[PDB]
Structures are given as C-alpha cells and as structure tokens.
Design a protein around this ligand. Structure first.
Ligand SMILES: Cc1cc2nc3c(=O)[nH]c(=O)nc-3n(C[C@H](O)[C@H](O)[C@H](O)COP(=O)(O)O)c2cc1C
Ligand SMILES: Cc1cc2nc3c(=O)[nH]c(=O)nc-3n(C[C@H](O)[C@H](O)[C@H](O)COP(=O)(O)O)c2cc1C
Ligand SMILES: [Cl-]
Ligand SMILES: [Cl-]
Ligand SMILES: [Cl-]
Ligand SMILES: [Cl-]
Ligand SMILES: [Cl-]
Ligand SMILES: [Cl-]
Ligand SMILES: [Cl-]
Ligand SMILES: [Cl-]
Ligand code: NA
Lengths: 175, 176
C-alpha cells in the first residue's frame, strides 16, 4: 500500500485519542512501526525503545497461554480479534489490557499491517463495561478515518465492536 | 467564535459517522445552523427544510415535558446533559432519541453554540447499553477533534460519557 495511504494512517495515529499501534506483517517478527502518544502514555515507554520490536515486551514470563494462541491464529489468518492480556508497564507495574486487533491494508488473509488498540482495564471503576464500549466506539471512528470500516457500515460496525468489547469485560469481571 | 473554528466544526460534522447538530445560542429561538448527514439520515428531513428551525420540531405536542425542562435549564446554565426524547421521523415514525448536549465556545454559562448528538434507541437488539456507550465514545472523539475536550482529557471524558449513556439506557429499558 502507498506511502500516501501510510502517511494518512500516521496522521490518524498522531491525533487519535485511543492508544494505537501498527505492526509490519511482512516481517517474521512483526515489529512495531507506529505507536501513538496515548499508547506511550499508558505503557511508560517512549518511541526509541519500542519501534522495531514485537509487542510481546508488555508481557512477563509466561501467563497468557490461551490468549497468545488466539492472537497467533488471528494474525496468521488475517482476522480481527479482541482479547484480554496480562501486561506490564515500563516500571513493571501491571495492568490488564483489552487489546483490539484489526487487519489493515494488503489483501484478505494477508494484510499489509495489523492495527492494535489497547484499553486499560481496572482504571474505570464500576463502569469497565461501558468504558470498554466507549473505547470500541472511539476506535471505530479511527478505523473509518483510515478506511478499514466502510462509511456505510460504520454505525453497525461500531455497534458490533462495542458489543464484543462489553461481552469480553463481562467475562473478565467474572474470572 | 472564530470563522476558522466554525469551519473546523463544519468539517468535523460533514465527515463524522455519528449524528451531529449545532444550534446558535445567540438567538433566543435557538435555531439549527448545522445538521450532518447521519442526523438527516436518521430523521428523514433534508438540510434545507430544517436549518433555521429549533430542534423541537422532532417532537409532537407537550411530550417530554420533564426532559424538556431539564434541557432548558442545562442550556441556560451552559451544561452538558444526556437525556432520552420521544421523537418522530419526517414520515411520523416514532423513535426514542438518546440526545447528548455539549456547550461549544463562548464563556462558562454563556456558550456561543450548543452541540447535539443523537443515538437511536431500539435498533441494537440486546446490546443497547454497549451501543450507546459506543456512541458516546465516538462522540468524545469528535468533541476532541473540535477542541472542546482537551487532548489529554479525552480518555477520561469518554469513560464518563459512556457510563452516563449506559445508565440512561438501563433506566430507559425499565419502563417497558
Ligand atoms: C498490532 C498488534 C498489536 C499488539 N499489541 C499487543 C499488546 O498491546 N500487548 C501484548 O501483550 N501483545 C500485543 N500484541 C501481540 C504480540 O505482538 C504477539 O503477536 C502475541 O503475543 C503472540 O505472539 P507470541 O505468543 O508468539 O509471543 C500485538 C500484536 C499485534 C499484531
Ligand atoms: C444542539 C441541540 C440539539 C437538539 N436536538 C434535539 C433533538 O434531536 N430532538 C429533540 O426533540 N430536541 C432536540 N433539542 C431540543 C429542542 O431544540 C429544545 O431545546 C427542547 O425541546 C426544550 O425546549 P422547549 O421545551 O422550549 O421545546 C436540541 C437542542 C439543542 C440545543
Ligand atoms: Cl475478521
Ligand atoms: Cl461506504
Ligand atoms: Cl440512521
Ligand atoms: Cl428541501
Ligand atoms: Cl439559522
Ligand atoms: Cl423555530
Ligand atoms: Cl408544549
Ligand atoms: Cl449548574
Ligand atoms: Na478500565
């Protein structure tokens, strides 16, 4: 996909109010090539340390067995996916992470990039379900400005993505 | 408000995927001066037939008496407000409208414009709560692009607007 389209994704990332990451999928390691300020603000890292590496560095040891396996399928398959990950800030302090993965660019089942958006659980008090839904609606806004969600489908896509995020938080709150 | 700021609002309205309206607060009639495609697509009216009218044309009679009193106070005070109205499309189909009101520009207690954003209840099946919160999330995104929510405050704003939206839905479903 063009640098025209790539620079447009960059601009969306810069102004976005949700944490956004974009990994290159043509490489084996799937390195970070974009990471916006809301994401840096969450994680404690800065651009220097993270661009060019795989996003696993947010995990410690081995604690996300079932969830990394679901990622690895969704990624190889080119499907979107919402999953919760035990993650850690740069100061090692922990946080659960509702991660949204969206295929970007390329062709079906082989996207040029994957987009990832992280919602921090535990920060929203009594309304994690609403707050995750909120996150999913804001993310849908960004996906439309990028071109992945067609305008004619933006409303129903937003509805189904907020619903997925709320169901996920309901399970997580029952773990 | 600056001409440049108004043009920015117009550009946000025209590309947004949520319904957005802008009302001129400097006239007591409080007319619609902007109404974007999703709003037109949900109400069924054209742009030309509604600009310059007050948004109450979506209602009939003296319905929404209490909610309307809440709106009038929040408009006078320059306060944000979320509230459900009975409304009608141009073909007189009725729908319940979760309306989001946001003051725009001016000073506290005295905004230049009010922004309004309409979420249609009854259309998301069993996910009414998550759909409204999702709407609130997209809206906060638009309010940030306008400059009304500070860049760093967006995530907080969103969390709180989505929770407000969700409570209203839960109450609305309890009526029957
Ligand atoms: C776009 C994108 C964003 C990702 N964001 C995160 C993240 O925020 N936190 C995390 O723990 N893993 C994240 N991952 C997952 C890892 O990069 C990796 O793909 C996953 O853990 C499965 O890899 P592994 O089991 O082989 O290590 C992301 C993956 C992609 C493609
Ligand atoms: C920006 C804005 C948007 C509004 N959108 C709607 C709307 O979609 N539907 C509706 O019934 N009223 C809407 N209203 C409210 C009416 O215009 C009016 O303020 C309300 O009915 C209370 O005033 P009244 O009792 O004198 O009619 C909106 C008001 C503002 C300022
Ligand atoms: Cl998919
Ligand atoms: Cl389209
Ligand atoms: Cl519509
Ligand atoms: Cl007309
Ligand atoms: Cl007018
Ligand atoms: Cl009028
Ligand atoms: Cl009346
Ligand atoms: Cl007040
Ligand atoms: Na949270």
């Amino acid at each position: 996909m063009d640098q025209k389209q790539f620079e447009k994704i960059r601009a969306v990332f810069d102004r976005s109010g949700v944490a956004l990451t974009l990994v290159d999928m043509s490489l084996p390691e799937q390195p970070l090539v974009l990471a916006n300020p809301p994401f840096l603000r969450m994680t404690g890292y800065t651009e220097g340390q993270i661009l060019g590496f795989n996003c696993r560095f947010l995990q410690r040891g081995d604690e996300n067995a079932q969830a990394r396996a679901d990622i690895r399928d969704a990624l190889k398959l080119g499907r979107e996916l919402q999953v919760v990950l035990r993650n850690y800030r740069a100061n090692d302090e922990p946080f659960d992470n509702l991660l949204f993965l969206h295929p970007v660019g390329g062709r079906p089942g082989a996207p040029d990039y994957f987009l990832g958006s992280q919602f921090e659980l535990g920060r929203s008090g009594n309304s994690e379900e609403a707050a995750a839904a909120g996150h999913a609606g804001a993310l849908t806004g960004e996906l439309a400005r990028i071109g992945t969600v067609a305008a004619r489908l933006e409303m129903d896509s937003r509805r189904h993505l907020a619903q997925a995020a709320a169901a996920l938080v309901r399970a997580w709150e029952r773990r």
